[PDB]
Amino acid sequence: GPVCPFRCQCHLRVVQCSDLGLEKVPKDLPPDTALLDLQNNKITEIKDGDFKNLKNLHTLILINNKISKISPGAFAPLVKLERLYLSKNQLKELPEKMPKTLQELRVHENEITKVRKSVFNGLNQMIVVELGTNPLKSSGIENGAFQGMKKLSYIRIADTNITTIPQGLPPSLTELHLDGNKITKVDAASLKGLNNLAKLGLSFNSISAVDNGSLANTPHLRELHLNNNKLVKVPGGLADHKYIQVVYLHNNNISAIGSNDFCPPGYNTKKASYSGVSLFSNPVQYWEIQPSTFRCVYVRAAVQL
Amino acid sequence: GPVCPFRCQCHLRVVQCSDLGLEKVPKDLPPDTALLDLQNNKITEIKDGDFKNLKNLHTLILINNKISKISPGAFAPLVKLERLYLSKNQLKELPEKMPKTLQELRVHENEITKVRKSVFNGLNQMIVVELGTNPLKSSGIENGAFQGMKKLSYIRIADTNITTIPQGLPPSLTELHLDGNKITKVDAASLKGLNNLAKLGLSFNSISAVDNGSLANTPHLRELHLNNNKLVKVPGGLADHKYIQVVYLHNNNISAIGSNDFCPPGYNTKKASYSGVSLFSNPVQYWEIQPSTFRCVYVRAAVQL
Numbered sequence: 001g002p003v004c005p006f007r008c009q010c011h012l013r014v015v016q017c018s019d020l021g022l023e024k025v026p027k028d029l030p031p032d033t034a035l036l037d038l039q040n041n042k043i044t045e046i047k048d049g050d051f052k053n054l055k056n057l058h059t060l061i062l063i064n065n066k067i068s069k070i071s072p073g074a075f076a077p078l079v080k081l082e083r084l085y086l087s088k089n090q091l092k093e094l095p096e097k098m099p100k101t102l103q104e105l106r107v108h109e110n111e112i113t114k115v116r117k118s119v120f121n122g123l124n125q126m127i128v129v130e131l132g133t134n135p136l137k138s139s140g141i142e143n144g145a146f147q148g149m150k151k152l153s154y155i156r157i158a159d160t161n162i163t164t165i166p167q168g169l170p171p172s173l174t175e176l177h178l179d180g181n182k183i184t185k186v187d188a189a190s191l192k193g194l195n196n197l198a199k200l201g202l203s204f205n206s207i208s209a210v211d212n213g214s215l216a217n218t219p220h221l222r223e224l225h226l227n228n229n230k231l232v233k234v235p236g237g238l239a240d241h242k243y244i245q246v247v248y249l250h251n252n253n254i255s256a257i258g259s260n261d262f263c264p265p266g267y268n269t270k271k272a273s274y275s276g277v278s279l280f281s282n283p284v285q286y287w288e289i290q291p292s293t294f295r296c297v298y299v300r301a302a303v304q305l
Numbered sequence: 306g307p308v309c310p311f312r313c314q315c316h317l318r319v320v321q322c323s324d325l326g327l328e329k330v331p332k333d334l335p336p337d338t339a340l341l342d343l344q345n346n347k348i349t350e351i352k353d354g355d356f357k358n359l360k361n362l363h364t365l366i367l368i369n370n371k372i373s374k375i376s377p378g379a380f381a382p383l384v385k386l387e388r389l390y391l392s393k394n395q396l397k398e399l400p401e402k403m404p405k406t407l408q409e410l411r412v413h414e415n416e417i418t419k420v421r422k423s424v425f426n427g428l429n430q431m432i433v434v435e436l437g438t439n440p441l442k443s444s445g446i447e448n449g450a451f452q453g454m455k456k457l458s459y460i461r462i463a464d465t466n467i468t469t470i471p472q473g474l475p476p477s478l479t480e481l482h483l484d485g486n487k488i489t490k491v492d493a494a495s496l497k498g499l500n501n502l503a504k505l506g507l508s509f510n511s512i513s514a515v516d517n518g519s520l521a522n523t524p525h526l527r528e529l530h531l532n533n534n535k536l537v538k539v540p541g542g543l544a545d546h547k548y549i550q551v552v553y554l555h556n557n558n559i560s561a562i563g564s565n566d567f568c569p570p571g572y573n574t575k576k577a578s579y580s581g582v583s584l585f586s587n588p589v590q591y592w593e594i595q596p597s598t599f600r601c602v603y604v605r606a607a608v609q610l
């Protein structure tokens with residue numbers, strides 16, 4: 001029957017095989033296994049029949065191995081897989097034919113250079129994708145690459161080499177994290193249709209300009225992080241926007257702030273109250289800003305200068 | 306109201322904060338968090354208040370951070386904690402006052418140089434301990450250090466500088482893994498009392514001698530891995546042992562094999578049948594072994610020369 005690899009721990013539907021220097025995926029594991037942890041081993045590839053009889057596996061952890069090659073439909077048998085963690089490996093591209101039940105994919109710190117729309121089509125359960133720390137470029141991501149995922153709620157591409165915000169992002173998105181890349185500008189086209197986006201993380205990039213109408217394309221944005229960039233003015237549209245509440249702009253090159261940069265002409269009862277605004281580490285000093293500039297901020301501690 | 310940290314994903318009692326470069330344990334997390342994943346961040350230390358209100362947390366993952374200091378009882382508030390993974394950090398010692406409910410401790414790949422018995426006193430729920438890849442030396446391990454774990458079933462100390470098998474191991478142990486260290490001899494005193502031991506892993510060490518009566522101290526041993534050592538002869542006591550079934554001796558310096566090395570005088574129906582014996586990559590050649598040497602092995606394929 002089922003065998004437990006020497007040194008591994010097989011207890012209650014869990015197969016713990018971490019830190020053992022394994023050179024390949026062990027076979028003959030208990031059929032009812034629900035979580036297989038192969039973290040920190042020395043696996044180089046996932047052959048076509050590495051996961052047979054693991055119909056009940058919902059979590060697969062392959063973090064910190066040496067995987068550089070994965071056979072198509074290698075995860076085909078994992079008909080109940082919900083989490084696939086492949087972070088800290090040597091993947092050049094994302095694997096094809098991932099279980100349709102997949103809810104989360106993490107490929108942080110690999111060698112991904114290209115992202116095709118083909119790899120994601122059909123994945124209607126995906127809610128979270130993390131692609132940070134990869135030598136990926138904007139040209140490497142196809143327009144509409146994440147389009148095929150009807151339920152995608154969170155996407156994070158951080159510490160890569162992308163220079164623009166990917167185009168054709170799934171409208172179901174509520175959080176878009178692109179911190180620590182090489183983005184130089186925010187264009188309204190890339191944010192078109194993001195009706196449910198609530199959080200936008202663009203900190204630690206090289207953004208110098210934010211096109212007019214960008215923020216309007218994310219009508220319900222609540223949190224906007226643009227700190228540690230190269231802005232020379234507060235992005236436009238904040239005064240008209242009705243849902244924005246947190247705007248971090250510290251560590252930029254803003255030297256002036258108009259009286260209508262955050263708040264509309266007088267008082268708009270329809271515009272939500274700012275709960276946080278950061279402006280420290282910018283050329284502008286508190287003494288160069290009319291007090292009225294923050295009239296629509298009643299919580300004094302909300303602004304940091 | 307509980308707050309989910311920016312970029313983290315908080316869903317179904319699970320707080321996912323991996324790969325974010327966090328410099329410290331986030332706070333104000335959902336009181337009902339069952340699992341906290343802070344893997345691959347830049348956390349340098351765990352302060353006394355870091356884990357308050359996490360009374361229902363059963364799993365804490367701090368793997369792959371830069372932790373090099375932990376406050377006593379810092380984990381104390383984690384009264385339901387069952388798993389604590391501290392692997393790939395910079396600990397010099399094990400933490401004190403760990404949740405008495407703890408069933409598994411993993412501290413692989415750290416900088417531990419000393420192991421105090423005081424750390425395990427009271428951990429009566431602890432079933433698995435992993436302390437591999439540490440500069441640890443035999444002098445750094447107190448006698449009966451793991452003595453306090455009345456229920457400990459598995460312990461692995463691999464790839465360290467220990468040269469001898471720790472003394473005063475809990476008799477409840479079913480698995481003892483000491484693969485990849487610098488152990489030179491197997492003394493009977495160390496294995497004394499281990500009546501429940503079923504697996505003994507000593508491969509990849511510097512073992513040249515196995516004291517007589519060693520195996521007799523592990524009467525129910527089923528699997529013995531002694532491959533890749535410096536044995537000159539097959540360890541004694543195998544013929545009188547009744548439970549031993551797997552004996553890996555490949556990759557050693559054994560020059561001869563007597564007729565009573567594995568099998569006893571005739572046929573002891575009370576002795577378990579071998580299912581796996583490896584002797585390849587040894588000075589001895591297959592034609593130098595007398596056929597009757599494996600009389601008590603009926604599944605020919607079991608032996609690998």
Ligand SMILES: *[C@@H]1O[C@H](CO)[C@@H](O[C@@H]2O[C@H](CO)[C@@H](O)[C@H](O)[C@H]2NC(C)=O)[C@H](O)[C@H]1NC(C)=O
Pocket residue numbers: 133134135136159160161
């Ligand atoms: C972003 O791209 C640059 C340039 O391709 C990467 O830096 C180079 O990395 C190569 C290895 O692939 C080195 O041999 C070169 O010396 C680097 N070039 C320069 C000009 O420094 C960089 O690693 C990429 N960033 C990420 C996060 O992948």
Ligand SMILES: *[C@@H]1O[C@H](CO)[C@@H](O[C@@H]2O[C@H](CO)[C@@H](O)[C@H](O)[C@H]2NC(C)=O)[C@H](O)[C@H]1NC(C)=O
Pocket residue numbers: 535537558
């Ligand atoms: C295998 O065992 C033999 C002993 O039969 C080892 O021989 C030793 O060799 C060294 C020189 O390298 C001598 O100084 C010792 O006196 C020898 N030992 C004995 C007991 O005579 C041999 O080195 C071993 N082979 C390996 C690869 O370790």
Ligand SMILES: *[C@@H]1O[C@H](CO)[C@@H](O)[C@H](O)[C@H]1NC(C)=O
Pocket residue numbers: 212236
């Ligand atoms: C953006 O809005 C500001 C103020 O309404 C305006 O001065 C600027 O010209 C606008 N940008 C463009 C490209 O028209």
Ligand SMILES: *[C@@H]1O[C@H](CO)[C@@H](O)[C@H](O)[C@H]1NC(C)=O
Pocket residue numbers: 230232253
């Ligand atoms: C900030 O803007 C001013 C005026 O445009 C420019 O002189 C200065 O070099 C900028 N600072 C940085 C760090 O780019």
Ligand SMILES: *[C@@H]1O[C@H](CO)[C@@H](O)[C@H](O)[C@H]1NC(C)=O
Pocket residue numbers: 439440441464465466
């Ligand atoms: C063992 O200690 C020595 C110093 O005595 C050191 O050079 C070596 O790296 C250590 N090995 C391990 C596995 O910790």
